Every structure is written in structure tokens, then in C-alpha cells.
């Protein structure tokens, strides 16, 4: 591949430069010792992120404020990176944004099934997943009104067309099912879009990483299977994204599995996920493998997949920042090193 410079060479270069300002392992360790909130803020100011720590007063300076500043930096950098690009890179960024927009639309669903004064949701909606019709859905009250505000003038319409008949949700949890249903539809759309419009090596990288994410969603669903009276295994197969690496040998068997014994046994059919179902923790190892995959995709250095790599790598970095800030400011030193810093 050589054509990539013609359309996203500048975008790739600036995204790589943004990657180079990640959390230095020594710097992160030094910040970890600086358990004091002010000391941690000073250390983070010493980090490449800049003078964000001095933007807010030390009085309100907390782990929540630190994560808010990190989210603001994420949103602004991602806004610049998508605004400076066009074409295939523009659509890729659009999709990335839709990933969080699914969750933001799910939050917008809250307040429709039960009146909830959507102003707080609008003020609290995740910025990276901003939707153009989000205020339009905010005004809509009835289920059909919100559905029209989402099936029309909102880009997520194909997902709400592949499922969500009348969007009643009288016996289907939004976050547990409806959010997972739209998430699965998004995962399928992403996978086929990568397979049909993204060149290699980014094509193969995107296929592998999307399979990883779909497998993560399937594993979470399987873990949540045993704690629900609803979500029958007939629905669980529907609940799965119907795509990914484990599909179909491990995905179908896990979906048919209902007892806890099926859960772990199913992950053993695949070599990559061996041990996650039998040791450690689901989410922590999920983030570990995701960061490793992001580094692997960033190694290619001349692919569209590098944008997704930096997205997910420094999403893991923001998760690590949350972990460290919480465990340091509020004094839980035992798992301060649970954060991943192999970037």
C-alpha cells in the first residue's frame, strides 16, 4: 500500500505524533508515588498532556475532575483529527464516533420509558458520541416519537431498522439488551465496512480487532446470562453480534450454553482467550489484550487502523488514569499497578 499518503498521510502523521505523547512508564510510576491530589496534578502537568491541571482550582481538583479533563482532551483531539480529514478517514472517524453514540443514544432512551427530565442527560451526554438529532430525541417523549427522532434525521437508523420493533422496551432492559442490540448491529456494520472498504494491512487489522471487541461483548453477555431470568439462549444467540473471531465455533456454543460451566468451557475452544474464563478478571484482561492489539496495529505505521489503535490505546490510558487517580487520591495503594502502561 502506497496510496494512503494521498488521502490521510497528514492525518496519519499527526495521529502518530499524538501517540508519541502517551504516558511514559517512568512518568506514570512517578505520578503514582505522588498520591496527593495536588502532587498527582503536578506530575500530570509534567506529562505531555500540558497545563490542564492548573485550569481548575485545587479545591475541586479530584479524580473525577482529572477524568473530566482527560475526556475533554480526548474529545478535542479527536475533533481536530476528524475535522482535518475527509473521505475514507472521515467515515472511519464517523464510525468511531458512532461507537460511543450508541451509548449516548441509549442514555437518551432513559427518560422516555420513564420520565426523567432529559436536561441532565443532555448536559451529561458523552461528547465523543455526539448525535446531531440528540436534542431532537431529548424533546420526544413517546417511544414512537423517540424512534422517529432516531430512525429519521439520526444516522443510527440502520441499526434501529435491523431490530427494535416499535421500541416498546416494556420487558427489555435498555443497557442490558437494547444497548447491546444496537451495539451488535454497530459491530456488524463496522465489520462489513472494514471488510468491504478498508485496504490491507488495515483491513486485516480492523477485522481482527473488531473480532476481539465482538468476542468481548459475547463474553460479557455470557457472564451476565446466569444472573437474569430473561435473555433466553434463543435470544442470547440473537444477543451476540453474530460476527467475530470466536464465531461460530465458540460463539454459538457459548450462546447455547446456559450454566456457568458452558461459559468457561466455551472460551477454551479458542487459543487466544484461554485462561480468561478460568483466571484473573474479565475486564482487566480484556483491556490488557485490547492495549496489546492497539500497539500491534500502531506498529504498522502506514494504515488507517492506526487511528483506531491510538483511540483504544489511549482509551486504555484514560482508564489507567482513572485507576491511578482513584487509588492514589482516595488511598487504595494495593492495586495501584493494575493499570496498563505498556504503550
Amino acid at each position: 500500500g502506497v496510496y494512503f499518503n494521498i488521502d490521510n498521510g497528514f492525518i496519519e502523521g499527526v495521529v502518530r505524533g499524538y501517540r508519541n505523547g502517551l504516558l511514559s512508564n517512568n512518568q506514570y510510576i512517578n505520578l503514582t508515588q505522588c498520591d496527593t491530589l495536588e502532587d498527582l496534578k503536578l506530575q500530570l502537568s509534567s506529562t505531555d498532556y500540558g497545563n490542564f491541571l492548573s485550569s481548575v482550582s485545587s479545591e475541586s481538583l479530584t479524580t473525577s475532575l482529572i477524568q473530566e479533563y482527560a475526556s475533554s482532551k480526548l474529545y478535542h483531539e479527536f475533533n481536530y483529527i476528524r475535522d482535518q480529514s475527509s473521505g475514507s478517514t472521515r467515515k472511519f472517524m464517523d464510525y468511531i464516533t458512532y461507537g460511543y453514540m450508541i451509548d449516548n443514544v441509549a442514555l437518551m432512551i432513559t427518560g422516555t420509558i420513564h420520565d426523567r427530565d432529559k436536561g441532565e442527560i443532555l448536559q451529561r451526554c458523552h461528547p465523543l458520541g455526539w448525535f446531531d438529532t440528540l436534542p431532537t430525541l431529548s424533546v420526544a417523549t413517546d417511544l414512537e416519537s423517540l424512534y422517529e427522532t432516531v430512525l429519521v434525521d439520526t444516522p443510527l437508523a440502520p441499526y434501529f431498522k435491523n431490530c427494535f420493533d416499535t421500541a416498546e422496551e416494556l420487558d427489555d432492559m435498555n443497557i442490558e439488551i437494547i444497548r447491546n442490540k444496537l451495539y451488535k448491529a454497530y459491530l456488524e456494520d463496522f465489520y462489513n465496512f472494514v471488510t468491504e472498504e478498508i485496504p490491507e494491512p488495515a483491513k486485516e487489522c480492523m477485522q481482527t480487532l473488531l473480532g476481539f471487541e465482538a468476542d468481548r461483548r459475547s463474553i460479557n453477555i455470557a457472564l451476565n446470562s446466569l444472573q437474569s431470568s430473561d435473555i433466553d439462549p434463543d435470544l442470547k444467540s440473537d444477543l451476540l453480534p453474530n460476527i467475530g473471531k470466536l464465531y461460530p465455533l465458540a460463539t454459538f456454543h457459548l450462546a447455547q450454553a446456559q450454566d456457568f460451566e458452558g461459559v468457561r468451557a466455551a472460551l477454551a475452544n479458542v487459543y487466544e482467550y484461554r485462561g480468561f474464563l478460568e483466571t484473573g478478571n474479565l475486564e482487566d484482561h480484556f483491556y490488557q489484550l485490547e492495549m496489546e492489539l492497539c500497539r500491534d496495529a500502531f506498529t504498522q505505521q502506514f494504515a488507517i487502523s492506526t487511528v483506531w489503535a491510538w483511540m483504544k490505546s489511549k482509551e486504555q490510558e484514560v482508564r489507567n488514569i482513572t485507576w491511578i487517580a482513584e487509588c492514589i487520591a482516595q488511598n487504595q495503594r494495593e492495586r495501584i499497578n493494575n493499570y496498563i502502561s505498556v504503550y
Binding site: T110, H126, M173, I175, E176, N224, L282, C327, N331
Partner: protein
């Protein structure tokens, strides 16, 4: 029990924080108005301590367990269990306070 409501309550709060980190966002908005009666209740107090009918609340878990569980990632159940343990600590502290008043 007050210094437990410092330490152990911090531990349960960080259980919630780890669950949020797994979910990547504050699940508090979803948890809001999740269920009418979560899996816990306070039974009527009844006891007689040192000749006085001190009313220590013997709270017990609701039979309809996990009425608002099963949402998000796998850490939700662990956070629910940690919250139930902290709530048992809370019932103990409330019973001790009711004794310290009566």
C-alpha cells in the same frame, strides 16, 4: 462502625469505581430509578438488652434478589454483592445507633 463507614465504605465505593471502569463510564445514571425495591429490606426491630427492649434493626435481603442487577459488564454482580455487604454493615451501624439512642 463509623471508622468502618470510612474504610470499608471506601472499599465498596472503589468496587463501584472498578465496575464503572469496566463499563468505561459512571453507571449511576443507568442505576437511577432502576427498580422499585432493590434486593434488601429492614425487618422490624425486636430485642431485649439488659432489661430494656432496645430495638436493633435485623435487616434482611429481599427475596426478589437482584431486582436491578444484570446490567453492563460482569463487574455489576460483584459490585452488587459488595454493596450488599456494605449494606449489612450499614444495618449493623443503624442498629447500634438505635441502641445508642433508646
Amino acid at each position: 462502625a463509623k471508622q468502618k463507614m470510612g474504610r470499608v465504605m471506601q472499599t465498596a465505593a472503589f468496587s463501584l469505581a472498578e465496575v464503572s471502569y469496566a463499563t468505561g463510564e459512571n453507571i449511576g445514571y443507568q442505576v437511577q430509578e432502576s427498580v422499585s425495591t432493590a434486593r434488601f429490606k429492614v425487618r422490624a426491630r425486636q430485642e431485649n438488652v439488659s432489661g430494656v427492649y432496645l430495638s436493633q434493626f435485623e435487616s434482611y435481603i429481599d427475596p426478589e434478589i437482584n431486582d436491578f442487577r444484570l446490567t453492563g459488564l460482569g463487574r455489576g454482580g460483584q459490585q452488587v454483592q459488595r454493596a450488599k455487604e456494605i449494606y449489612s454493615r450499614a444495618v449493623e451501624t443503624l442498629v447500634e445507633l438505635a441502641s445508642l439512642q433508646t
